[PDB]
């Protein structure tokens, strides 16, 4: 065989392939997909069909490059109101293949051979490999919970401020923030936003805000975007996804917005990476935004209704998890839940990648033995910090009510309904 | 005023993210670009509507990273019969965001700092910035016509074999061939394939074969896959594109196929660049392939009929270009035609003190003055060899007959039929 692509990371340790194979083999109740197991808003789906059947022959041929005009116009209209700034749809917006390619273009376009990039743990999968492929030097800080009080919220997962400030120096090029957080569901409050913002200003660093779950914060809390804080617009790039916005994860269309000066770099990467994105999908998404745009302050707006929809599911999962004996972290946003398992550790029941990490062991055991699949949070930590995720497990509650209930009956039957 | 030494220098905007703005500004007869003017096969468009409207909720959520299982299976079935070998759909094929991202994954995945990459001029423009971004060192050889003086064939555009072998040394990592060739339309015969194949076998270099136009070769020529030469399968990566195979450039789905050992590198680049490609589009393309797989030898097969559809249009354009004074190169394949325009070629009636490669100026002045697009072939040459393309223009003849007559009319009037 060959070897290394050319001094790469070869992240074949992509948890997803491993767990997809496991689910295929054991067919469990799958709480590990990362997407809804039912249908997305009908208007969006019909929009794609209408684009496919469009009478315009150009509806399915190459579109602009930096973004389908109908789409970038709609995105500028939405985010212009959200950040109270007129965003230039042609120079301050870039459509990319999902938020994923947006991340890639921003790190590939702004991180060079020895640049430091601080990453908050647990991190979304691609953050470290992308940094490393850009030649950058990742610098990790974990979010860690406060275990006292009883109940636990994603708000209780916090950073050490002294550690955080010590991580920043003149070599810091970039910091990647994820709000709402995957998978904790943590929503950064203004104070937390201010801590990062002041650091970025003090050391002149680019702030990359992964805000894919921006519309899913649960009522008590509020999503606040760092690009709105004093002095941050000029040093922030924020990212979103149509997949997350409209629950159409297989559509793989996302975007970055920010000052043209910063977006320029993403453009040079994008243009010689994929050059342009699917035209019928971008048209369908544009009509989806136009639709919501007309009812943005209405409770039936999908941007407003998603949270109510998921909140019931979140409280249900939190409840049955606590039931079985786990301690769930209640998320402030998103559709993932992390819970601390204190069931039979690496005892008679565990014996797998024993060498490896216990959360892998547990999650594969429950799939095989109980028929319930979750994901191991250890996968989202740097090797030296992996032990912080070993007591936990990630579940997704964006699921049909009957499947959530099946999961509850399996845990009850496993536990012993009292 | 920082620097991005990742070699993402210059290239402020590719030719596409320039001329695509000129057309979408002066809205002329768009013969530049590279797409059909009219509807693509209905069975394909129908298949996309069907995927958006599928009762299966997974049809519009995340599919396998390396490619939708249905597409990969169909891709393997097709290419297995053409390459005369069973290709593994799971490890020897990778689905990508057009041939563009396939090319990107291949270069990023196989060329490290200092690797030499041989590119043949004129070349599809992304080859050079891709190898630059990977830290590679491009080496160029131009194709030149055989003492031509008017209407000739793309067959007489040839490279100097002694110049070619001279380029091969122990630093040579890869060579990129494009057949059918953009923008000449050149189809490499067996002898020309054997020449680069022997050099690849002697110098242990990777051959990358861009064959997105594989189904548009005109009689009496035929497309030959270099991966079928004696010992080439182990050292060749072959690329195709659904946008070109099914005339749906807007779908942006391509693929790479070859030995598992070479494909792993690609997988790793893709995984950490975009992770996955649109699911409903991949499904629609899979259904397209399954449709054609049943009538491979029928004249109704789009793989067979497209060249007969294009041939008449090719003949028409060669005639009206020659009637207006140009000396066109009749392509053996594809839907592009380059022609030598002679307004200043031997007449001092024109002179541009400006000094900026004439084909850019001639071609821009047409869309703005006569409402006829076209693109400057100097954009497909390395900086020192650009002058080679200055007396040429590339046109696309994949258009409705009525628009083709429109071009010939604005050309006759422009010159003066009388
Ligand atoms: C934090 C985060 N960032 C980025 C992405 C990527 O989004 P996309 O699927 O649009 O590429 C995800 C996807 N689930 C995500 O959770
Ligand atoms: C030679 C060549 N290679 C690759 C591509 C890109 O293909 P795709 O649009 O499928 O990314 C083109 C596109 N016009 C091309 O001409
Ligand atoms: Br609806
Ligand atoms: Br809520
Ligand atoms: Br909110
Ligand atoms: Br023909
Ligand atoms: Br071989």
From Swiss-Prot, chains A, B:
Protein name according to UniProt: Kynurenine aminotransferase
Glycan-linked positions: 146
Entry EC number(s): 2.6.1.-, 2.6.1.63, 2.6.1.7
Control of this protein's activity: Competitive inhibition of L-kynurenine transamination by glutamine, methionine and histidine but not by tyrosine and phenylalanine. Cysteine concentration between 0.31-2.5 mM increases L-kynurenine transamination while concentration above 2.5 mM inhibits L-kynurenine transamination. Keto-acids as amino acceptors modulate the transamination activity toward L-kynurenine.
Lineage: Eukaryota, Metazoa, Ecdysozoa, Arthropoda, Hexapoda
Effect of pH on activity: Optimum pH is 8.5 and 10 (with pyruvate as cosubstrate).
Family as reported in the entry's similarity comment: Belongs to the class-I pyridoxal-phosphate-dependent aminotransferase family.
Entry annotated with the keyword Transit peptide: yes
Pathway(s) it belongs to: Amino-acid degradation; L-kynurenine degradation; kynurenate from L-kynurenine: step 1/2
An MF annotation (GO) of this entry: pyridoxal phosphate binding
Native source species: Aedes aegypti (Yellowfever mosquito)
Temperature-activity profile: Optimum temperature is 60 degrees Celsius (at pH 8.5 and with pyruvate as cosubstrate).
Modified residues (N6-(pyridoxal phosphate)lysine): 244
UniProt note on tissues of expression: Expressed in developing ovaries. Expressed at high levels in the head.
Cofactor field: pyridoxal 5'-phosphate
Assembly information from the UniProt record: Homodimer.
Name of encoding gene: KAT
Catalysis performed (reactions): L-kynurenine + pyruvate = kynurenate + L-alanine + H2O; L-kynurenine + 2-oxoglutarate = kynurenate + L-glutamate + H2O; L-kynurenine + glyoxylate = kynurenate + glycine + H2O; 2-oxobutanoate + L-kynurenine = (2S)-2-aminobutanoate + kynurenate + H2O
Binding positions (substrate): 394
InterPro entries per UniProt: Aminotransferase_I/II_large (IPR004839), Kynurenine-oxoglutarate_AT (IPR051326), PyrdxlP-dep_Trfase (IPR015424), PyrdxlP-dep_Trfase_major (IPR015421), PyrdxlP-dep_Trfase_small (IPR015422)
Chief place of localization: mitochondrion
Cellular location(s): Mitochondrion
Positions bound to pyridoxal 5'-phosphate: 62, 99-100, 182, 213, 241, 252
Pfam families noted in UniProt: Aminotran_1_2 (PF00155)
């Amino acid at each position: 065989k060959f070897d290394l692509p050319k001094r790469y990371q070869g992240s074949t340790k992509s948890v997803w392939v491993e767990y997809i194979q496991l689910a295929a083999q054991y067919k469990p109740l799958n709480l590990g997909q990362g997407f809804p197991d039912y249908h997305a808003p009908k208007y969006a789906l019909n929009a794609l069909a209408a684009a496919a059947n469009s009478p315009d022959p150009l509806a399915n041929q190459y579109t602009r490059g930096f973004g389908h005009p109908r789409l970038v116009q709609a995105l500028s209209k939405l985010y212009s109101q959200l950040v109270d700034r007129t965003i230039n749809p042609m120079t301050e917006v870039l459509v990319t293949v999902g938020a994923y390619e947006a991340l890639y273009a921003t790190i590939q376009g702004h991180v060079d051979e020895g640049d430091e990039v601080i990453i908050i743990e647990p991190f979304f999968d691609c953050y470290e490999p992308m940094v490393k492929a850009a030649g950058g030097i990742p610098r990790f800080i974990p979010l860690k919970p406060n275990k006292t009080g009883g109940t636990i919220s994603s708000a209780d997962w916090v950073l050490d401020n002294n550690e955080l400030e010590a991580l920043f120096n003149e070599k810091t090029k970039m910091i990647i923030i994820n709000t709402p957080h995957n998978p904790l569901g943590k929503v950064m409050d203004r104070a937390e936003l201010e801590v990062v913002a002041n650091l970025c200003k003090k050391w002149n660093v680019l702030c990359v805000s992964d805000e894919v779950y921006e519309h899913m914060v649960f009522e008590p809390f509020e999503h606040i975007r760092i690009c709105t804080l004093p002095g941050m617009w000029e040093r922030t790039i924020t990212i979103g996804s149509a997949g997350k916005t409209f629950s159409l994860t297989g559509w793989k269309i996302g975007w970055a917005y920010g000052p043209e000066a910063l977006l320029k770099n993403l453009q040079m990467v994008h243009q010689n990476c994929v050059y342009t994105c699917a035209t019928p999908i971008q048209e369908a998404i544009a009509v989806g935004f136009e639709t919501e745009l007309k009812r943005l302050k209405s409770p039936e707006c999908y941007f407003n209704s998603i949270s109510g929809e998921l909140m019931a599911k979140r409280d249900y999962m939190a409840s049955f998890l606590a039931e079985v004996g786990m301690n769930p972290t209640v998320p402030q946003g998103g559709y993932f839940m992390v819970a601390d398992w204190s069931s039979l550790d690496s005892k008679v029941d565990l014996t797998q990648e024993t060498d490896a990490r216990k959360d892998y062991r547990f999650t594969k055991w429950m799939t095989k033995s109980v028929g319930l699949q979750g994901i191991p949070p250890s996968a989202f930590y740097s090797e030296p910090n992996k032990h912080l995720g070993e007591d936990f497990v990630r579940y997704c509650f964006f699921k049909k009510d009957e499947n959530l209930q099946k999961a509850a009956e399996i845990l009850r039957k496993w536990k012993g309904s009292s």
